[PDB]
DNA sequence: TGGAGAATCCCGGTGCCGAGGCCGCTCAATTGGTCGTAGACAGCTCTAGCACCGCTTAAACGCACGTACGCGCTGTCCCCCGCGTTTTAACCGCCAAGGGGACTACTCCCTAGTCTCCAGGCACGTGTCAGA
DNA sequence: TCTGACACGTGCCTGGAGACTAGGGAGTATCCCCTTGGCGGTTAAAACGCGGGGGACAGCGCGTACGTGCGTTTAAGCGGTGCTAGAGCTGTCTACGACCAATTGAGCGGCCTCGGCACCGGGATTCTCCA
């Protein structure tokens, strides 16, 4: 009687769980009511941000000649982009390290 | 022979800005954490992940503070960092009144 | 305990197919997804409380993304969210 | 007792080398130990507050993550 | 008395009740015992179901708009924008109605000036439908009474006509540009004017 | 809705010959609203961490210990516990 | 019924317990709000208001002013260590700054 | 109505001197003023952008005081005295 | 005639403008700056008087705090004169870019 | 070291504008009762945290040498402060136009609530491939 | 060249999706206060010029204090065993908080009054600089 169980992420063309985002929005005490398009929109935004981080981290891993994303690659991915560094300015990444930066007055002449 | 004073420091800067390992030893930091937490509550158990998280946070905070300290030392036409650089870099961020 | 690990698998295999990932990297990405979710949801809750609205809709999430995310990131995130909402409302 | 001397001079030197410091004074180490003690006191005090709210005798990684999140020191990788 | 209209006049369609309801003095009897002697200058027409801007578009049968479909000429006050009111009155058939827009008085302006306040020039005293509702002491209780019975408001027979475009409905739909607001030519007391529609 | 009369009552309890201005009362209203928002958000976050759906006096007590500095936290706990004890016994 | 007693009256407070209860219930903080939470939070708010107002009154008395202006609130906050720590990211409008000239700028 | 250009010169040099006098500055270089103008422009853009976003979310044309207060509390610069 | 030494009138101005509570920028140029900044985001935009007053108070307090940090950076470099590098160092340590 | 001149503080009088008290009312707090249900409380499992011993070996510590760097002193000359004069536009008051927002009924779509069910997601065994 | 951490396949389970309803939240429907633009005298303040002085800055000597290297110590770190506090889950039951109906009183808008403080002016007291 009931039709085929089509997920909402397939309707939205997304990969993040629209249903889980809706359930987390309902139980998080954010508002009394939660609209239909808010989990779709939030899942799309989170999927785009995850995609951007994984693009830059995979590029950093390929530059270091290894096929596995380690936390150093995520730290390089975040800090080497200006906008992701602005979004993650107050964020410590564990096993992350720092950028190689030596000032001009410290280098020998 | 004997190297010039400064090139081993530059080599250490280059080799410690590539690794992601933890620079303070585990057991002295664990003993320091337990000694500090003894003042707050008596007979506290600690997860190992709690001490590792405290070590990661403390190392990141000290490295960022040393970057600001180096900027303050370079600003005063120096390469040697001094405690006034640390005090200035902590007062500008608001950590000291 | 629920997490976002298989969806990070799906996104990574979509965009970097011959590239693996570590466990600590997944913990970092899961914490990143949770942090951005809490940021946008708290900003949308504040936007709903300021305007005396008891419903969070796509406009509040869009405005939260415009408030939180930096410029080109905000523009592309609004574009992706608008595409997903139009595709979801178009297909019934 | 003591236990601030376990944060030794080569450890502070290594942290300065990671920060980019070329030369370090001899008065840096005591100041760095004091600053580390202040920071650890703040985070450990908040973590003990979160632990004693939950009626537990064990400080977890969640409590440390939330204590760091309260100060603006958000730490990924430990379940945050 | 002889200066009262009957129900025979209201058996009109939408556009002649828009046209042939001009120059008739709208006289309201508030309980102090005084008259107003106010003559209207412009009206508006709503066809109903085929009119996209009407309240009864597509056969709407809301319980608020209930005093229209039992007889032509039934008066209908409807609340607009919280406190304001507007004067609709039905025509022959269900849906067709005409709206009262603006009037000019010849006497009684002091009482309407006093009752207007909860800056008060004669040009802006009642230049508006909500202005004339607030200047005639009209409340929401006047929906249950018609136009031509007993002692309340009625009309008096008086002694060019320019059609203007619709203003205030937006540039959308298909029925929002038909000229249905007929107003007197050369009057400087018109609230909404049309300087390009006066040349036919 | 504002906290104006309560701030005036507290002011005449503390300094009985000292008044206040409108800008100062607006600032005190903002201070009370900000501290309320801080403590209530902290208590909501604490209840969300410990899987509780209620906000009790314990939640506000550890929220005050989290937010306020040392002597402020100790004394705020002192009159808070005094008020809860007086409320439950009367 | 009996005589209506305010919850602030039986809690010994001047701040409203009921208004804090309503704002906690309508603030979307939790699904339930306990009975002692508005009493406790009203006591904390009353204490902090009294601490700011006592030092503001002292600052107004030191300036020979009966009334409290924003400058007295700024001097009350920025001279106490704990109140300045709590209000470190807060700008008081029409408040000014503390009079602070550095020692190396003063003449010898 | 019209377009407004080059209003950063209205933040005059004596105004920057007076703001530095309140900050405790005894001697001011001549290149301070353009940097202070740029800093003020960056700060005003960052606050007014969030205030405009809060205004456009409410579907209004006027920027209220509460929009600016929310835009500043967004950036950890909470302002007391203009409502809240 | 009479002439004060360089620095006396500056210290008098420091005392005078630290004693006062006024807003130091003229109101109309700051208002016009607010209009020309907001016209790059949304055209046909209106402002209340209190919004411009709030922007002026916040911007003046931010500039006063920045000048305090700039003065301490100048004092750290053995100077009494503030320079653009002082402002750049204070904003870099605070985290502003 | 004394003394002139500018600035600053003190005291007395004037007026105005806003804080502060009073009053009617109405809206939200209080009181009493009922009804589920979240959470206190006891109990049991078994996880992981602590205590301790050995060893081996990398890291830490003390000491010597010395060279680079901080720091005090000195000269100079550039740039900014102080002040006077001139010019610009900010501040105040008044007035008119016009879009924009208060404002409350109404009416309709949309989102919470609930039942059912089934398939996506989580826990766990397997080999297998990248990195030291 | 090994090995251990991640990719892959399988079973159950529980929460998300289809589907229907209820009711309530939000969009929409002229007019008057708010904001903006202009005019115009007034004068406070910005702007420009110029003298000069003092502070930024480059150069130089020196003296010492960290850098670096090496021998010796030492205790971190890894493995292993053992044991018991205490996290974590479950079951039960009951106190407590949401919800609602009637009541009533305290807080809020409106109104009016007089005193605190800003301002002006004259004189006494610092206070800064120069012969």
Author numbering:
A (entry chain C): 10 to 118
B (entry chain E): 39 to 135
C (entry chain D): 31 to 122
D (entry chain F): 23 to 102
E (entry chain K): 82 to 199, 208 to 248, 255 to 295
F (entry chain H): 32 to 121
G (entry chain G): 11 to 118
H (entry chain B): 19 to 102
Article, verbatim:
The engagement of a DNA glycosylase with a damaged DNA base marks the initiation of base excision repair. The apo nucleosome structures show that the presence of a DI alone perturbs nucleosomal DNA globally, leading to a general weakening of the interface between DNA and the histone core and greater flexibility for the exit/entry of the nucleosomal DNA.
Cryo-EM analysis of the AAG–NCP–30I sample obtained high-resolution structures of the NCP in both AAG-bound and -unbound states, at resolutions of 2.9 Å and 2.8 Å, respectively. In contrast, the map of the AAG-bound NCP (AAG–NCP–30AP) was identified as a post-catalytic state. The ribose ring of the –30 position is in a flipped-out orientation, and there is no density for hypoxanthine base at –30, indicating that this is a post-catalytic AP site. In general, AAG attaches to the minor groove of the nucleosomal DNA at SHL-3 and is angled at ~70° against the plane parallel to the nucleosomal disc. The distance between AAG and the closest histone is beyond 17 Å, and no interactions between AAG and octameric histone core were observed. The inserted β-hairpin loop is composed of IIYGMY (residues 160–165), which makes extensive contacts with the skewed DNA and serves as the damage-recognition motif. The flipped AP site is stabilized through three sets of interactions and the interacting residues of AAG are highly conserved. In the AAG–NCP–30AP, the engagement of AAG further distorts the nucleosomal DNA. In general, binding of AAG led to further outward displacement of the DNA around SHL-3, and this distortion was local compared to the global perturbation caused by DI in the NCP–30I. Due to the high solution accessibility of the –30 position, additional local DNA distortion induced by AAG alone is sufficient to deform nucleosomal DNA and allow AAG engagement to the damaged site.
